[PDB]
Amino acid sequence: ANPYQRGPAPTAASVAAVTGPFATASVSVPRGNGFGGGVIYYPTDTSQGTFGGLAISPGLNGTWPGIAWLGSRLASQGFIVFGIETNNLNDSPTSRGTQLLAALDYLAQRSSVRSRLDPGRLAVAGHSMGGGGALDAALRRPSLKAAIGNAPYLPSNTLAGNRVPTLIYAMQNDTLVPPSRLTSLYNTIPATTERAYLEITGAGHNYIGQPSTTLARTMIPWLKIFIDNDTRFSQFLCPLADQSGIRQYRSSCPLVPATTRAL
Ligand SMILES: [Ca+2]
């Protein structure tokens, strides 16, 4: 068996649901330890083992409440999800990256939920400059299992040398972070690094500010495949089982989880 596998066999309905199969709880975290604090969401059921973790950053002038719907929606699929606040509203993309890594370190070493977490199975995500943060974090910490960038503004616009499986969302109508920019970004990812690109039809830059089934139902498979090695979820992306709301999809299917570290 896959020792990291959690939860029942999925369906299209189960990955699209507002709440998944796991009951969840949260705890607030105050400012400190290198970042602005935030909220940790987690499954309360311990009987299937520890869960992997995801830290999520807002963008410039953003706070976690603006995108907080991700917290319980993702956690209830069997993940520990840390939505962060930044030290300052005007923090840079590389700064957001620093703070995502600081949040993951706090999650693993000091948080009240650290006993529920598998500290070897962590990921990063974010919106806009927070997505740039997530990508920059991935470049710095290749042991991360996954990175998800929503309209990610990475100043360099290059992922050369990235080893972390990366999912990028582009908003069709966005001009701050246009699809053309995000196409170029995707195309810098090394051929040996698993990757995907999804353009959302009719979406503006701040589409993610409202709950989105289109986002949730494609993010959840990505996290399951790469954080949990859980190829029960490959059926949602390889091929794309439902193209509702998606203008363009590119990926390196079949999506194969990273090999286990050398003994
Ligand atoms: Ca592949």
Numbering used by the authors: 2 to 264
Copy the relevant paper text:
To provide a basis for structural investigations, we selected the most performant enzymes from our Round 1 candidates that also expressed well in the small-scale experiments. DH11, was successfully crystallized, with the crystal structure being determined using molecular replacement. While multiple AlphaFold models have been shown to closely correlate with independent crystallographic models of these compact α/β folds, we wanted to validate this here. The crystal structure revealed a Ca2+ ion, a feature known in other PET hydrolases which has been targeted for rational engineering due to its role in stabilizing the protein.
In recent years, biocatalysis has emerged as a promising recycling methodology for poly­(ethylene terephthalate) (PET), an abundantly produced plastic, due to its potential to selectively depolymerize the polymer under mild conditions. , A number of naturally occurring hydrolase enzymes have been discovered that catalyze the conversion of PET to its constituent monomers, terephthalic acid (TPA) and ethylene glycol (EG). − Most of these PET hydrolases exhibit promiscuous activity related to their native functions as cutinases, lipases, and carboxylesterases. In this study, we use the term ″PET hydrolase″ to denote enzymes with demonstrated PET hydrolytic activity, acknowledging that the observed activity of these enzymes is very likely promiscuous activity. All sequences shared a catalytic domain with the Asp-His-Ser triad within the conserved α/β hydrolase fold, as shown by the alignment of Cα atoms for each Alphafold2 predicted structure against LCC-ICCG using mTm-align. In this study, we applied three consecutive rounds of machine learning and high-throughput (HTP) experimental characterization to discover PET-active hydrolases.
